[PDB]
Design an enzyme around this catalytic site. Structure first.
Site, short mmCIF file in Angstrom:
data_model
loop_
_atom_site.label_atom_id
_atom_site.label_comp_id
_atom_site.label_asym_id
_atom_site.label_seq_id
_atom_site.Cartn_x
_atom_site.Cartn_y
_atom_site.Cartn_z
N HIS A 96 0.84 -1.24 0.00
CA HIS A 96 0.00 0.00 0.00
C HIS A 96 0.86 1.27 0.00
O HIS A 96 0.46 2.31 -0.61
CB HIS A 96 -0.94 -0.03 1.21
CG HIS A 96 -1.98 -1.09 1.12
ND1 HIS A 96 -2.33 -1.86 2.21
CD2 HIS A 96 -2.80 -1.48 0.12
CE1 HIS A 96 -3.29 -2.70 1.87
NE2 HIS A 96 -3.64 -2.43 0.63
N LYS A 115 -17.49 -6.48 4.62
CA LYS A 115 -16.29 -7.15 5.20
C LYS A 115 -16.20 -6.70 6.66
O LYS A 115 -16.38 -5.49 6.92
CB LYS A 115 -14.97 -6.80 4.47
CG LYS A 115 -15.07 -5.93 3.22
CD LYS A 115 -13.70 -5.49 2.71
CE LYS A 115 -13.75 -4.77 1.38
NZ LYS A 115 -12.39 -4.64 0.78
N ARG A 124 -1.68 -6.62 -8.12
CA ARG A 124 -0.72 -7.59 -7.55
C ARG A 124 -0.96 -8.96 -8.19
O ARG A 124 -2.00 -9.13 -8.87
CB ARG A 124 -0.91 -7.74 -6.04
CG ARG A 124 -0.38 -6.59 -5.19
CD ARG A 124 -1.21 -6.49 -3.93
NE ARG A 124 -2.61 -6.50 -4.35
CZ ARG A 124 -3.58 -7.33 -3.93
NH1 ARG A 124 -3.36 -8.24 -2.99
NH2 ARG A 124 -4.78 -7.23 -4.46
N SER A 166 -3.17 -7.74 1.94
CA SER A 166 -3.81 -7.59 3.27
C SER A 166 -4.20 -8.96 3.84
O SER A 166 -3.92 -9.18 5.00
CB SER A 166 -4.99 -6.69 3.18
OG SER A 166 -4.56 -5.37 3.36
#
Ligand SMILES: CC(C)(COP(=O)(O)O)[C@@H](O)C(=O)NCCC(=O)NCCS
Ligand SMILES: CC(C)(COP(=O)(O)O)[C@@H](O)C(=O)NCCC(=O)NCCS
Ligand SMILES: CC(C)(COP(=O)(O)O)[C@@H](O)C(=O)NCCC(=O)NCCS
Lengths: 157, 157, 157, 157, 157, 157
Positions: A18, A42, A91, A129
């Site tokens: 990040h 979430k 990613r 994450s």
């Protein structure tokens, strides 16, 4: 276009990945807003207050970066900042088609609103994450994966 | 970083998808270099000279855009322009992992050289030059898929 | 829509996977046209004439199935048959996004022309003509992967 | 085979994408059953009653389409209708291998039961229920993505 | 390296796919530990006690295979067994990049710890725990997908 | 199973990724055969003789590793070595489904022949021979991507 960008995220927690994205994006835009989502859908590991303090601490060294809490429609948030660019990170583990779908959804809601994708550095290309939460959740060492100035915060709760 | 961007490609031929990326990416950099690679090893349908002349005509309206044909490694070409940002497009049929790999290959060869990704417009998210070459080879109507200022040429040779 | 279906392909060579799709798709249309494309640009291992003769022999038991070889755009071939439905097969190694793109490319070229997808049998979900060509070129046993009424030929030339 | 098809779904809510699939599939089958799942495992945004009324309203203009509520095993449901064809929709964001796995699971439970895949129109190729729920959940305008005759229902609750 | 391997899993329930992996992996290693995770994050269909008894029953015919209950960090578990190899299974529906990410995470936590991937047999290549739970949950016949000596256990609860 | 492993490849040229797989896989088998396939149909940049000599030099330090060049089907080559285990590498840009298919194709041809997958080191997870061939053809620095004991040669011809 180049005046302002918004980098939305849960940042649960902020990773080295990040920080790479905040770094590269802040170099291109006169101002970067980092928009810290509620994400209640979430159920995040860290609370908004924790996640705002981690990212505000992790980004003190960037002078054109502002952190705001946000619970709304990204398309509307960009309009209120007259923002024409959403910053997103890509990613190895990205759902690439989902990222494209989100770019076209946001542009359907706000015809000015373009999406731009940055990469983290190679050393961070496999950080997500979700990895970091797993390693935290399993009482593993996540200190190689997150900025050192926020590890004290995460390691606790 | 904001001084110069390079949008590299084979552009065999340049499509409407490519034009959306030039349009959007040119708004972010003071100067955008469209770098047409020979790509011998690929067996491009159009000569390097035809491909340069097509993109040259298709970009003539963009005042900060410059087109160049190159024989070498892209990473060395960016070093010669003091260019730190490569521009690439992302589409439905992109090989997402290969784009990431090529981003990191370009970085390992020129340690100052990040890659940034834009999207074409939703109408053009389904265009690939490979589709376009099939239609051209079977002598079909590609008019809807390329900029008209080039179609004089592809339609013929 | 139910009057005629077209199952287009290179069929280099026709495999047992292809036969399952012809079997299942032929039960849904009054008439199924198996359209063998020259596919010059590909460099098919079998001549267009050998490929037509192989599928012709492999389909002779299916009474509503007709095989044709064509040089042009598929979208124009369907317009000549007043055909509104293309039939394609989906397999483990399908390039799913490219099939979607080709579906929409075919639609943009012939605005009446939808694409429908069938599956082969589970035993054959792992067959590709590309596997089959490797085995044939290294002179191995492909008997288990193609209809036996063609194996006289592929095994030889 | 062509007598009856079943189109199973949560339809949470019905999108323009679903209506395209109901349209194309109803043209091929003498009768299409739209089977509205409980999906409790997924905790749907709209209740079964809402989701049955939206899809019954969205499909009044198709005379061979029937809507039923269903909480069981698709394989068994198809047997009780003597149905040999499950209709499924394919989109850019599909988990393609998961769709194939589901086709072979359903055929293992009922050896008569084949799966057929339809595409929505290009304008709808990036629509997914999950997008539409996100835009609804975030108090965004979903009116471009769902049939107008059901927007009054969704927008509320 | 070849002295001991660990095969971690939820085994919710153990499938024929898992037994293939236990079979091939136990042939290569002097000892295979099957480590049965709590997975609370995932709320498993079968309880740890059920999942330990199913896999202990399903593996009585392998003399070098031990089953242990485990709720910790795989990297630490491997260190306490002086284990240098994590066994993982690869299938058509695998998130391949996620599997790679997990291999590099585990090796970051324990620099001795390598990951090795086995395939199930072709007949089992489309089996996943998630399928089997769906077929169970929907009161379908899962008896073709799981070892017969554990079906009595699963079918109940 | 543990007596002999075969690591097959085109190795055009052998990269540092390949060396990690040889290193790790050789620790698990009493003897590892590195099998360099002619791969005529591919159009390898290096002759079969250059590719054998490169891997031969790059593996000379591994005492249980033996290199061989072969013209035939791999499945027959393993039967000649009484080899039951093929070794393959998995990378970020692997075609995961094609590897699975090739595993099952190899099994269907030699019913004793399983395929096992290793990973290279994280630094090398982003290397492909295809990247390496581009850099070599554009006369760039591949020194960082291949074992130095071969770079005398690739750099030249
Ligand atoms: C041409 C391209 C930009 C890719 O473009 P394409 O995807 O449009 O073919 C890439 O192949 C390239 O940079 N070629 C120039 C030579 C080079 O630098 N190759 C090494 C890549 S790490
Ligand atoms: C041959 C095929 C059906 C694809 O078949 P394949 O996947 O078996 O090679 C496709 O390439 C085709 O339609 N070719 C004919 C010419 C054409 O219409 N090309 C433009 C595609 S939009
Ligand atoms: C060379 C290879 C191992 C794949 O290697 P590569 O991925 O490094 O090119 C494969 O093509 C092979 O086995 N070739 C030898 C001939 C053969 O057996 N082909 C049929 C494959 S089922």
């Amino acid at each position: 276009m180049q005046k302002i960008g918004i980098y939305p995220g849960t940042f649960d927690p902020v990773t080295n990945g990040h920080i790479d994205i905040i770094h590269r994006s802040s170099e291109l835009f006169e101002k970067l807003i980092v928009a810290v989502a509620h994400s209640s859908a979430k159920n995040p590991m860290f609370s908004l207050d924790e996640r705002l303090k981690m990212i505000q601490l992790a980004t003190k060294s960037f002078k054109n970066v502002e952190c705001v809490a946000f619970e709304g429609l990204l398309a509307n948030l960009a309009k209120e900042y007259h923002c024409k660019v959403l910053v997103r990170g890509l990613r190895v583990v990205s759902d690439f088609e989902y990222e494209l779908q989100m770019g076209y959804a946001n542009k359907s809601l706000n015809h000015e609103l373009e999406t731009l994708y940055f990469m983290p550095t190679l050393q961070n290309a496999f950080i997500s994450s979700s990895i970091v939460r797993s390693i935290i959740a399993h009482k593993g060492d996540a200190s190689h994966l997150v900025p050192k100035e926020i590890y004290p915060l995460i390691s606790k709760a």
